């Protein structure tokens, strides 16, 4: 027996992955992520899922590619992405993970759906 | 050559995916309590059946095997509504599938 543990967080930099900072990626950090980060429902998503504190031994048994806004935040500040599509995929992974692991109607799903609808509003104005 | 790649690489990669478990065997609609499943899904398909077909010289060519893969994905998108958890799992599996077959020899 023992205490269940959290896996290491996802990487926020990589010397082998090409770096870039386009105006869309700037917009994703200073507008899109900025709006979601300050939302009232943002707190469960600003850091990797803490399965230990949440007493969720099955979470990382189900989710093998976790994602959070704190990882996304560091990736944007580090110019981790080459384009906006790569960053948008990290957002969708975060949402999809929450929708697969939790039931429709759950509080965490209601909060994730609210953040996603706001996310879709901002990326609809992604600049040229 | 291409049928070897689908059995040795493509299926092996998808079978080890985190969201592969609902698609590794035929849908037992009775055990899973899905009474309308086979009324709606006329041609069920799964990676376990594709494995048996790839091992037993079933497919005429690699394109027939790819059709069975797409049928498996299409079935999920037909039976479950968009945004369902199982649908999202199928889309993740499908995206990896399209990436692995895009490098077909």
């Amino acid at each position: 027996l023992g205490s269940s543990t959290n896996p290491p967080p996802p990487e926020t930099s990589n010397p082998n992955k090409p770096k870039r900072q386009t105006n869309q990626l700037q917009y994703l950090l200073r507008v899109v992520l900025k709006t979601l980060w300050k939302h009232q429902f943002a707190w469960p998503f600003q850091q990797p899922v803490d399965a230990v504190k949440l007493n969720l031994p099955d979470y990382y048994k189900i989710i093998k590619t976790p994602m959070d806004m704190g990882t996304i935040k560091k990736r944007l500040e580090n110019n981790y992405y080459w384009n906006a599509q790569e960053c948008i995929q990290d957002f969708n992974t975060m949402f999809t993970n929450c929708y697969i692991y939790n039931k429709p109607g759950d509080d965490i799903v209601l909060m994730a759906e609210a953040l996603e609808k706001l996310f879709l509003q901002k990326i609809n104005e992604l600049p040229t | 050559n291409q049928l070897q790649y689908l059995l040795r690489v493509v299926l092996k990669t998808l079978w080890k995916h985190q969201f592969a478990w609902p698609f590794q065997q035929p849908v037992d609609a009775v055990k899973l309590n899905l009474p309308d499943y086979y009324k709606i899904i006329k041609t069920p398909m799964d990676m376990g059946t594709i494995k048996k077909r790839l091992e037993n010289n079933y497919y005429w060519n690699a394109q027939e095997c790819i059709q069975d893969f797409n049928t498996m994905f299409t079935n999920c998108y037909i039976y479950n509504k968009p945004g369902d958890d199982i649908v999202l799992m199928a889309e993740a599996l499908e995206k990896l599938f399209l990436q692995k077959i895009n490098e077909l020899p």
Binding site: P44, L56, Y59, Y101, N102, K103, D106, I108 | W21, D85
Partner: peptide, 14 residues
Amino acid sequence: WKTIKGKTWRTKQC
């Protein structure tokens, strides 16, 4: 609790 295709786990709701 959530069940997907013969597999069950605890959600954040529980």
